[PDB]
Symmetry: C3
Subunit: 535 residues, 3 copies
Amino acid sequence: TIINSLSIKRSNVFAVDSQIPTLYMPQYISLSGVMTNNQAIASFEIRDQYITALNHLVLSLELPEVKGMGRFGYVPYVGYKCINHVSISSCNGVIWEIEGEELYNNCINNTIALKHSGYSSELNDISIGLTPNDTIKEPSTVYVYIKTPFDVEDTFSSLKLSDSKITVTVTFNPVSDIVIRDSSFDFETFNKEFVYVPELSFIGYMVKNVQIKPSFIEKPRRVIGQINQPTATVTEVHAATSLSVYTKPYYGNTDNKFISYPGYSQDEKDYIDAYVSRLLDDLVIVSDGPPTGYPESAEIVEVPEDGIVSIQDADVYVKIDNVPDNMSVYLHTNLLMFGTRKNSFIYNISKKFSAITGTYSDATKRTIFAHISHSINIIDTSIPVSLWTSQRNVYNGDNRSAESKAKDLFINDPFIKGIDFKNKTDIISRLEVRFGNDVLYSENGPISRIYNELLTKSNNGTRTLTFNFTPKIFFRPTTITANVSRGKDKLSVRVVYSTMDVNHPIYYVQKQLVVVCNDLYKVSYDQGVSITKIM
Amino acid sequence: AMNNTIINSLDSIKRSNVFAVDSQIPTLYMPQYISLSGVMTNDGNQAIASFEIRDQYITALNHLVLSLELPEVKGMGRFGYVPYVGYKCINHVSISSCNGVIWEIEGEELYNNCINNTIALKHSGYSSELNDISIGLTPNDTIKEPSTVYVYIKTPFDVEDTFSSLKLSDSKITVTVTFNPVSDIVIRDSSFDFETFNKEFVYVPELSFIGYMVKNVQIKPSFIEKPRRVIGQINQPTATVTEVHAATSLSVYTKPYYGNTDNKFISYPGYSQDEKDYIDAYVSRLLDDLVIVSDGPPTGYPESAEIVEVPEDGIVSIQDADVYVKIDNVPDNMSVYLHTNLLMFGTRKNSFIYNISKKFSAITGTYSDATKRTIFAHISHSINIIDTSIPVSLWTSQRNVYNGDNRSAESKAKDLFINDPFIKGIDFKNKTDIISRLEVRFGNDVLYSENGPISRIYNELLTKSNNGTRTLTFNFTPKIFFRPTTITANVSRGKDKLSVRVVYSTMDVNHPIYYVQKQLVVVCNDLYKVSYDQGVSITKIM
Amino acid sequence: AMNNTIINSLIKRSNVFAVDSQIPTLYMPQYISLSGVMTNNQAIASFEIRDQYITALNHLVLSLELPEVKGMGRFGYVPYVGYKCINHVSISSCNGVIWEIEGEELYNNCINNTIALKHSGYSSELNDISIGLTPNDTIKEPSTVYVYIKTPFDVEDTFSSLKLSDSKITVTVTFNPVSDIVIRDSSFDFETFNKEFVYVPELSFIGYMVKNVQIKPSFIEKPRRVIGQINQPTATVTEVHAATSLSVYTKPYYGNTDNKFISYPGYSQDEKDYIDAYVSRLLDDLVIVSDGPPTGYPESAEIVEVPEDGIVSIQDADVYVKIDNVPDNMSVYLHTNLLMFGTRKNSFIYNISKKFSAITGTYSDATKRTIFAHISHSINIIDTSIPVSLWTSQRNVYNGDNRSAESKAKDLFINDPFIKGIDFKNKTDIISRLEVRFGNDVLYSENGPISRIYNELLTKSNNGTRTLTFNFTPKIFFRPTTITANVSRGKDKLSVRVVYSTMDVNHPIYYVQKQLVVVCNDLYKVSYDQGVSITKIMG
Ligand SMILES: COc1cc(OC)c2nc(C)cc(N)c2c1
């Protein structure tokens, strides 16, 4: 019966003519560099007569042993966060360069690349050293994959350099960015003694009778707008393949100090749970007589026999078992509060708790919490302490114990986007992109970001206008092209940020609009490597 | 720097250049994300949204994403959304032109096509904000906050991006979406005012797509696979697909039919959707009634219930079954009781018994003086995913010679209606496989037979999905660039048909799951030709 | 409507908006399963594939019926049980072998295939250590697992398929001893299990009925592996004439041990999971609540009563122990040398008890046992991967295993054949320097694992190996780029030298034997003139 279901020319899908390729030989080449210092710059010169092509740059980084006292840990993906800039240049000048946060953005979907850059509990959990000669973190090496457009189709897209001298340059962020630390930590010494120790590897190709043809290249150019200004403009846009827009926070009006940090565990729930844990130290107190050692502005109340404390309309159920007879259960009813006028709405972190149950330990003399019912969110965990106690706040603001406040952590991670530590909250309410002075694209919802995430299979997308839907390398990229006489040589982005009540500390986080334009360049090989901005 | 060992190993042959490419110039186009509001009709009385795409400068399109605004939910009761709510709103999608339907899919088959796309799934609505069962306490309590979800209508026009795009230059395309009843996409208890909710709820859709404006487009015809689904009669282990002339694939699976029930269940895990999560939720709900600490016999259980005091050694023997219960810090005036027949089923008056209490072996915990409740520490049990998937109706069916549901009234109050339209198998995780043998017949000849789900193994293996189906794939030829390889269900030897026969596993007449009715679903992908002569038109290959 | 600015912004050109749908070869695929012949020393299954209507095949999937396991004791299956059953696979024709792979290399090839791994057996039903209580109690239910025998014939689906038109193909599978795939305690009757156990396999594949097939030759990579002698940091691969890649890794050798370990996490295979199972097993003896000094421990044990202070000092190391709700007639004791190792008396000591910082918990009056709340410790993956044998080694001047007899009874034999490194997660990297010589000249040397970094990076796998990849050319459509021999200059061999990093002679892990593994992928030419044959390229 099958013989029934089975004249004309047909393409063979059961055999292929195995073509003989170019004769080449690859080699993983590692090379130490020159480190020079203001900011730290590593330079790697690649000049070898027998290296014909290269791609897949990996910068390795040896992190020191960290000994002393205080709490200290590394930002996630520390390797990528070390990099402020990378430039690939020849004797004819720059071939390609990228900003560190955009390199991170391009590799943010490479899970293996991310893990190699430094993502472990050994690196990213906040360790604590107890003696001035105690070891906080052990020495370690991380690997940063410098993704470049020369890796896209491997040998085909490789950087050709036969009889050219190419120099890879890495500018490093201040070590302050890649470190999360306590006050007790001697950052002053650390900053002083720490140096970047880098080494650049690449896959080099020795090619016999190489046939060089020109190619095309995309270079992301980044523009940051002014603080709290909701627009940014990219000039000299003649051949752009895509345009991405995102917001980033500006923490310069603060001390960059936050109450809680989860460590290696970076899920939204983890960020929340760590916060709740730090708050719970002061939120529920078991003591003999009214608790001591809180600001006078604190309003710590004894829990009634019903177990319910009413903070305005908010009811909080607190039940601790095995409390000593001489002790009572107290609730800090305004652990953190913010208000801009005396007759305003008030943001009170204690009101975000509904139920706190646990058990007192006679042996260890502390409370062990069992079930916490609350409505703490990712934003609460991302509020700089400074904002709780800003001049705008008519209250004291920070009513924590000094013991709690001491454990606050400085975080200066340079790649934060949004207003929360997970980039969860979307604060762009409307988006308008103008090419010249005409509106090119507008949206009320984040449909450009939905398509971004959808089209790239990523959970970390951005509002992105992609103009190239053409397979890269085998075709000249499709671009939005400029008319210079009509004035269309600029891309202006303007947003309308989403509105919220002025009595939330997060309202006072300063915002910066980031616009990234991918310009098309042509890579030429007449008398060395050279690039040319398509116009 | 390059080792000299390499330099030596490196004349007279033609070689392909593998270090450079000749960049071809592509068709001149410009893409644009276009969104569209639509026309809403509640006559079909189902709700239907229609979107017309007619623009001279839109030459081609692909990647349809339908957005949906979910409202604020205020009131009293427990309420939540099924996971991937957006996909569960869709009962049907049709893409049609002036010459008629070009492509249409059933809502459940769109979902099946998108199950390995985790991003498409997250976008459709998957969060603890959306899918955890929230509770309102006052008639003005907010249960759910308003939200927008985006559902990716995967089409054959997305497969090869611009190449597979639907060309429509000089045609008017209409996308029509039929919506399932909102009852399907909602999980709620009895306290919730669904009657009002259902009345006030409206679907608010908006269709986006990637539009392509092409200069001097050179249009060529292509081919399209259309999934056609057939559902067999209730509890019948056969289904037949007719008019099969050019099938690229054939998929088989089962669905439960809960129409003989109220669709109410004892427990639901919420956002956490792991098999372990479904079980843990169930055990948690039972434990409220399974072990009681009271002064004197517990009260407010049916007279049918058999609550026993736990002996000093901790062991209650329920027939052949032993259950170890030890609760710490019990008051002196109180005792520890075990509900020994929380849920039980039997078909004859003194025969075998399926009794949920007997599936626990160990229960330990500590009584809390402050909260006047027991906190469990470790539960050893043998509850499975099937137990968590039994409609309550079946516990109290006429077929049951016992009372059946001997839980407290308080427990029964927390039961939840679940009407998710895309359930497969007989449990909520589609874990239990009830097909023992599968046969596909074209006429009297067998085309394929299997004892294990090796067709599903190949399915998941070849498509990198952890959620596959028993699938006979006939086309292994690269799509879009080749005409798909198809099987024909003959034409001359009578009718042109594929009939599927399965052998269901045999199950106990005293387990409730026996009475969950099952339906066999067969899905056939027919090959169609998409022609663009004088507008877009399709033709079933025959 | 396209926004107005776009419509304004818009030579030979390639069409990217329609394509010429070509008519492919006329074929018909069929999922074929095949029971085989079973042969026994080693267990061998054979499958012959000869059919008038099967022209080509690819995607071999081996089925495995696991029996019901009834009886008493603790028993479980290694993760990816299906892959761990396979000791060798060979595909051969009347002209001889076409392709063959060792079980561990097939596994390595699929280790980033999450579905293939899941299909082979990765579940709590399979990989959690269940316990049987009655001689007729069910420990494990019957189950089927599916093993994807990835071959070079799957790279490009129909294009790379093995053509067998008018040939008899034989797939042969050699099975490891079932001892390898099972994790069990002493109470389990392995003796009966092993006698009654049989491998029940079935080979499936995708077959193609092809009308007028036009066969052309192809190329194939065959992974050949060389294992070095125990603890030897060199190995050599001879007759290297056209290699596409070269990989190096380490394995432990547990022949000096009974293959018994104190703890196993079960299905939960995260490194933290391994540690928690260990710490959990230790805590049974580590903190004891009894009326008067604990009983039933070796006389060698040093159990001390915990002071009212709560701090017990074991040499420089302090251990804070506080258990709530301890009965009045009972005290809290700390076992201060649960496991200890030393090679000389009055020397350094490796003491597992000194690795705990804090132990808090609460005693249960109802169940007469302690429930631990918080453990501060520094147990690491290595501690969890030490054979019990090594604690009670002749090298040890101490007793070593001062655990209760109850504890020691619960220890589990593990004989998983694909363990890498010296710890159960391959976490510790013990190669400090790597040198590869082609002939006698140095081809590659590295001081960090940059070759592994690149391996993982280029293959999107988090389980890579130090690997020298020579072929960066797309498979199937091109002849693979190879490193080529100069047999004339002696350059027909690949020699690997490592410098293992050394460890403290007072840690038990120093005494775990290690083996160097080298895997060479040789290029062969597949021709189909008068049946299928392969030919080793000798450029
Ligand atoms: C869209 O870009 C393509 C498409 C293809 O098929 C239509 C290709 N096919 C082969 C064999 C090789 C390629 N580089 C290739 C690239």
